[PDB]
Write an enzyme that holds these catalytic residues in place. Structure first.
Site, short mmCIF file in Angstrom:
data_model
loop_
_atom_site.label_atom_id
_atom_site.label_comp_id
_atom_site.label_asym_id
_atom_site.label_seq_id
_atom_site.Cartn_x
_atom_site.Cartn_y
_atom_site.Cartn_z
N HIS A 41 0.72 -1.15 0.07
CA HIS A 41 0.10 0.08 -0.05
C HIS A 41 1.00 1.16 -0.04
CE1 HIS A 41 -0.31 -0.54 4.48
NE2 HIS A 41 0.27 0.70 4.59
N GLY A 143 2.58 6.19 9.58
CA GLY A 143 3.98 6.23 9.20
C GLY A 143 4.89 4.78 9.81
N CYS A 145 3.66 1.49 9.39
CA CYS A 145 3.65 0.57 8.29
C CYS A 145 5.13 -0.05 7.74
CB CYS A 145 2.74 0.72 7.32
SG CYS A 145 1.09 1.08 7.84
O1 LIG Z 1 -3.85 1.67 8.29
C1 LIG Z 1 -2.94 2.23 8.03
C2 LIG Z 1 -2.70 2.92 6.78
C3 LIG Z 1 -3.89 2.37 5.80
C4 LIG Z 1 -5.13 3.00 5.72
C5 LIG Z 1 -6.19 2.02 5.17
C6 LIG Z 1 -5.66 0.90 5.03
CL1 LIG Z 1 -6.40 -0.49 4.14
S1 LIG Z 1 -4.09 0.75 5.53
N1 LIG Z 1 -1.83 2.88 8.85
C7 LIG Z 1 -1.62 2.76 10.26
C8 LIG Z 1 -1.99 3.90 10.93
C9 LIG Z 1 -1.99 3.76 12.52
C10 LIG Z 1 -1.63 2.29 12.99
N2 LIG Z 1 -1.20 1.44 12.09
C11 LIG Z 1 -1.46 1.65 10.76
#
Ligand SMILES: O=C(Cc1ccc(Cl)s1)Nc1cccnc1
Ligand SMILES: O=C(Cc1ccc(Cl)s1)Nc1cccnc1
Lengths: 304, 304
Positions: A41, A143, A145
């Protein structure tokens, strides 16, 4: 003595953290040999995440569109491919800090360390467990990921997880290092709800053994139980069914303390039916399920 | 979102861990520049620990009696001196992996990471706090002495602790990197009992702010309190008195959430008087006091 939620030293993994920028999206990558692994992504914009067609989105991307930065030097990308939900960016320079490594897909209940990163720079390390519903309760922000989960056997690092997403319930979903998601999650911004978060029974038992080894014995009682009896009580409290395999894995802990596994199950049964009555076990007021039997033996023996 | 007891990445400190052997005693050392820091009880035998005269015991030791081993190479010791309860072994080779570092003596309530080591090899990393009675609740075994506590500000490591001993109550005592013990502890095998372990009030408040920022708001009530009112309740529950200084330090957390510090004190007061009633805050069934206000802001903003 003393028991802590202890993570593996992160040094070997810090040397593999890089920054991957694709357009306006920046996340973390894992640089092992001449390959940089990152969540696919990275090629999406916030809007794309609603209904992304990654093969289509990928066509519009070239080697020069992926900006890989290690520390402050730029890595040249000579190839890119999509394996499941991870991108593999082949670079021209092999990571000089590449430790001995393996890619392993862990089972639920198993525990691992997470080196949380932002802009390819590590910010913290914590110990997690893969929940039975295939989610993790980590601490990740935007940030984060591309941050990875790992185990270490002396000098070899077993990469087991890459962070991909936060579900609307604040729990975390990710893949193994081959891009396959743990559980039924997909890298889409859609309605994804996790299943029941059951307690990892074999892990609570291991932590009860760890408590006994450290002096916390108040919960020890005069009773015993059977696998089928205990499991009737485990079922009621959303605890994973305990198998003869879990009993065997607790064997070394049962041997060191001289407390039979079914006797500890009967102690756990009483803790479930009656609560802690304001008491603590290892400084925790609830039953901890994020130490495997292997972790207890390791922490209690000092495996380096 | 999500909140974890997150330790600093240990990589910079792993590069400084060495093994120090003196006679039949082996412990951990900290190699910074051409100096190896280790606990002075490396020169003692188990029996000596009852009534040790370190200046006398030191006279019988020469440079060639201290065996310093980094990884698998031997370091040549060209000088040795005792500074308080730490030995400083001057070696001929400066540590090529010496990061930017400082030696700081922390205050109680402050938190730091520990890289637990055995035979100069790191085995795990966890986040600790210096208790108000100057003890730490770590996870240390025999051979762990010389393991260090530290904080990191971007690339500079602030060494604040060296592990020296386990008190008969299973709690831990150690020194700063100048050899001065935290608290009234001495490196003798004698009756040393720690004082009251009070709860770090400013840290629980910070963790209540962290919970609010992550969605756990059930404990928020319609009440407020004053510093003197709250402190009457803090006194009763063995909580550290809250000062106007602690209120100021919670200012940025109070600003981000829009919850006045005294309103959160009133929430904490109700939690103290009535308990959690079987509920959890950030997955914990008790009030966590090992996150400072700085740690909450750091974890919640992603400081690398
Ligand atoms: O989830 C996402 C980015 C994405 C948006 C939509 C999706 Cl499908 S993946 N960041 C994130 C933010 C905070 C903690 N873990 C991960
Ligand atoms: O306390 C010692 C060695 C000492 C014996 C008598 C002393 Cl005074 S110092 N090791 C230890 C073991 C487990 C955890 N932390 C420390």
């Amino acid at each position: 003595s003393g028991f802590r939620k202890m993570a593996f030293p992160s040094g070997k993994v810090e040397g593999c953290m890089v920054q991957v920028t694709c357009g306006t999206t920046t996340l973390n990558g894992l640089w092992l040999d001449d390959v940089v692994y990152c969540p696919r992504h990275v090629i999406c914009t916030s809007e794309d995440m609603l209904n992304p067609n990654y093969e289509d989105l990928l066509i519009r991307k070239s080697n020069h569109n992926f900006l890989v930065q290690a520390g402050n030097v730029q890595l040249r990308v000579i190839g890119h491919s999509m394996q499941n939900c991870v991108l593999k960016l082949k670079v021209d320079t092999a990571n000089p800090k590449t430790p001995k490594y393996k890619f392993v897909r862990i089972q639920p209940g198993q525990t691992f360390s997470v080196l949380a990163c932002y802009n390819g720079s590590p910010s913290g390390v914590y110990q997690c467990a893969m929940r039975p519903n295939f989610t993790i309760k980590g601490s990740f922000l935007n940030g984060s990921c591309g941050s990875v989960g790992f185990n270490i056997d002396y000098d070899c690092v077993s990469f087991c997880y890459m962070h991909h997403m936060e579900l609307p319930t604040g729990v975390h979903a990710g893949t193994d290092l081959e891009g396959n998601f743990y559980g039924p999650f997909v890298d889409r911004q859609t309605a994804q709800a996790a299943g029941t978060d059951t307690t990892i029974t074999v892990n609570v038992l291991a932590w009860l053994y760890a408590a006994v080894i450290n002096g916390d014995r108040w919960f020890l009682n005069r009773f015993t139980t059977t696998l089928n009896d205990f499991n009737l009580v485990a079922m009621k409290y959303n605890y994973e069914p305990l198998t003869q395999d879990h009993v065997d894995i607790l064997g070394p802990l049962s041997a060191q303390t001289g407390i039979a596994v079914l006797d500890m199950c009967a102690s756990l049964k009483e803790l479930l039916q009656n609560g802690m009555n304001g008491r603590t076990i290892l400084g925790s007021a609830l039953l901890e399920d994020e130490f495997t039997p292997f972790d207890v033996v390791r922490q209690c023996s000092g495996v380096t």
